Amino acid sequence: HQDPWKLSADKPDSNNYYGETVANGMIGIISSPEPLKVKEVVLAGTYDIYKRGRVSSFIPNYNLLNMKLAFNGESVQTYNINNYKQELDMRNGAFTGSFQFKDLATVTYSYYALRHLPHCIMMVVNINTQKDTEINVENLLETPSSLNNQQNYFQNITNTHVNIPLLTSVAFTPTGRSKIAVSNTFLFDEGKKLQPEILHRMNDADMHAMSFDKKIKAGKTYSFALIGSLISSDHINDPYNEAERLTIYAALEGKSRLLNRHMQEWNSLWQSDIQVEGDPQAQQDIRSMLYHLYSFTRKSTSLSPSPMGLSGLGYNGHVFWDTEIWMFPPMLLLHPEIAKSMIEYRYQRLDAARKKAAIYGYDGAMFPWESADSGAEETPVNALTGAFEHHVTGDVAIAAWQYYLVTGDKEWLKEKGWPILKATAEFWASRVEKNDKGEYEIKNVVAADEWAENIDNNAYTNGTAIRNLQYASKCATVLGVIAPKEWTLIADKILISKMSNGVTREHDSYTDQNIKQADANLLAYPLKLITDKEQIERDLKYYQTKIPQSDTPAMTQAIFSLLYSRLEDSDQAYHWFKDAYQPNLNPPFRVISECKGGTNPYFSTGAGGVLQAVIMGFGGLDIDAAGGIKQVKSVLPKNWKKLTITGIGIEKKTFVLTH
Template sequence: MIGIVSSSEPFKVKDVVLAGAYDLYGRGRVSNFLRSFNLLNMYLEIDGKRIDGKSVSNFQQELDMHQASFNSRFDYSDKATVSYTYYSLRHLPFTVLMDVSITAKRDIDITSASVMEAPDALKDVQNYYNEIDKPHVVISLLTSSAKSPTGKLLMCASNTFLFTEPHGQEPRVIHEMWDNNMHLMKFSKKIKAGETYRFAIAGSSITSAHHDDPLNEAERLTIYAKLEGRDRLISFHTRAWNDLWKSDIVIEGDDQSQQDIHSMLYHLYSFTREGTALSPSPMGLSGLGYNGHVFWDAELWMFPAVLVLHPEIARSMLEYRYQRLETARRNAFANGFKGAMFPWESAETGVEETPVWALTGPFEHHITACVAIAAWNYFCVTQDKNWLRERGWPILSATADFWASRVERNGPGKYEIKNVVAADEWAENVDNNAFTNAAAKSNLQYATEAAKILGIAPKSDWVDVANSIPILKLENGVTSEHATYHGEKIKQADVNLLAYPLKQITDVGQIKKDLEYYETRIPDEGTPAMTQ
């Protein structure tokens, strides 16, 4: 639920991004991901000198994908070796942890501060500092709240120090207010040569999109983390990630491919979570790319691996679509169609969020079939008939109805789908795009199969439409990308997806012919990874 964007500067975090938090601001007049409070930024002073990137040596940073930790280490002059690690805690979806270790090479004095800073886009920032003094613990809470750019959301964050000293011997914490957008709390400590001093910062960030009372909840979650303690927080986080990695994809004899696969899985797991009813954008929680919107990437490219390795997470991704099914019905109605039509770019509500200058929003309709295909594949893997009845069938039947109304019925074998943006997005406003037509056929066929499994009479029209949607060919026998395709360069794989994952083309000779043809139509640069 929290994405931490790393920085090459010691003790800095570039951005903190929250899943499910959108507001109408920035480019495109559409909902965008929001930067949240940067609740892990800190500074460290040694003998009165503040550490920065220019003053350290042997600076190393490492992402541990198995433990989901970002580890940094450096030397400071001849005075200290410093390491720190931060975590977006897997078992606590709104909580993060910074773990710091300082080994003194000579007697030193340190001052360390946790700095809470509001991003520029937020407004009406309020800063709070509170100390809760109990017989067994003192909890220092550095807290901030602000409204999102339109005032739609209340965004809140809080953090606290976790000290290793016994109660009553902890360093004294001092609060400083710098300006409306930034405040901090700090402490000082003497460390003798040869000693290692450890402390941590735990914090939580949450919005009114996630909780009705985010200000108090941010502090409650932070207090909980404080009293759990560093060791338990890291232990439970590690255990959760170990459970994720019990499912794996193993590549033998190719270390680079193995690392690439693990990187992909790590990011998929980092961007998704069981029980959230959220689905990842192409850049996940690694920043504000693609405005945080959900595209076909979620169902067609990310979903298959998640489905096989962790179907409980795949179910959450589909729940995101199911909860927006009624909005998809309204979208179909507005465009003159029946059933449900999912948006090309989706955010919080499920309305179309594509900026108006992009034709993909009004015309890249294959997304609707991609959602349905993912729903069918979920059932095929899990064999969860109750889910199929309650969640899958409403999606499959409504999307099948969409395609039955979307085709133009121009005679047997000519139920055409005209005026679309292809999966190859350089092909705009074309007729009978190969991927769109084939995905629609799959959608209709899977809806028919689902009906039979559930003991529901399928609409005979679905079979008729599926059998009548054309897949065009060029004169040389190659599958044509669309009705007016004449060998132009392509941006994305399109025709070749009919073999996999759609399985609408199964003849080995045809698959080979299509691959050999379209691999020569790919530019050397400017195309996404799915094409290269």
């Protein structure tokens, strides 16, 4: 079960099963323990009011791959199959199930979120017979109860060469905000004259189905494919016609052409990779982390991942600083074009951040704690983070400047980076208060440690305000524009204090409290405002004791690891690397939950952090304040013989580390 490219489960246990995701950055499909079913389908970019938090949310969508298979009229179930196995191939995001049905046939099915076609899915089914049998195949389009006002259609698209039967549904999100269309077809090898007749049934208010029978002689393989397109009014003006057009297109491209295009794009993604020798479990876990970030993002878009990517409705699908600080850095080093999409999401929401600033009495752009379609604040009103956790504005500024450092794209800096950096600097210039000693305070925030609410001079917050002001000033210099001199003046005098034990104080009310996650430690990495190794160690040793086992998210231990890696202490670095995710795992695919012993995977924020512990920590790779990637002192775990990191920076550099 420790293949470096495949996650495997034998006889799925529905009582203890956390499904795995295949995704192309637009559609996520989460596995069911039941054969030929999917648990959940999520479409990126589609939000409406729905359940949790009374704010916009991802919407459970059509389980468009749901299939029923019968042999000689006998329905295939978990209870009458044997040797049932599930496997995720991380090389191409293929989810495959395989089983034996009695004395009749072996069934293999593989499904894909097609990497090149953001709105298209494909499942390929192979039936290998040991006896003469007849299969009945049904594909069901059940309207989930999240949607309303559904319509169920079926038609034949024909010419002299083809009969493409389309099973289509159209429905609406709860408030009618978004119209969803789904269109499915079956692909056969045998041709129009010999292919099975497709029947259509509409027996339920919320379900219709297309079906066929096929006689298969003993000793033969019969193959068919299901193609489906899933799109909304958030993506295209006319989703109904566009879904049918896309499925017709995909059918006439065919299975072979679609899988070739899919493989080419996944091959490109894996040109940036992490190879560990001497630790097969680490090798597989790190692949799973890269796989999830690659699956949950998409180059050449304005999409940004939620903390759970496309693994479900975690945090309503909203975008947090979890992108800028946690998932963005590893993607910027491995595939800058993914980082570009993540910052594009924020650039296209600059107007909404300017609006939020105005409503709360500030200047410039105030990015929301939680973001969705418009870029307006989406934090549930019962959570104080929405009105009061303000470091997110600096987090967006930091990512924008890092994007420029790593790419050196000055045209991007002029058109997108500077608009972000200038407006966010203007926010911080209006957000600080000067005190009687000429220092600048930031008062009444929620800290990065979110347990500390409506407090003053949060360390991490003050750090991001400093970097935002400094990077806006450096940006102005790169573009030959005059920055307000107040930005540098404010940045130099923003308060960061030590307690009487020589430890950086989290906020003005802090002494010895338990903390939710890393805050003061983030001034060392990623902000690098603290470079003194003795102050890093003091802050490490103190705060690493303050994180409780329970209800603490995976936004902490990965940083402890990276910093101990920077201080060249293997045992500590490796201890914190494991603690960062191993206690958060769910069976049978080792998906990551938000918290230790949690049951809400997949927390791609957590994977982002650990990838930084590996690349910036063990690999010693670092964004150089002067541009591009450099390498500082690092160590490897005792048990790792070699760490290889490929496709780094715009030079696509390979880094090899050994003891």
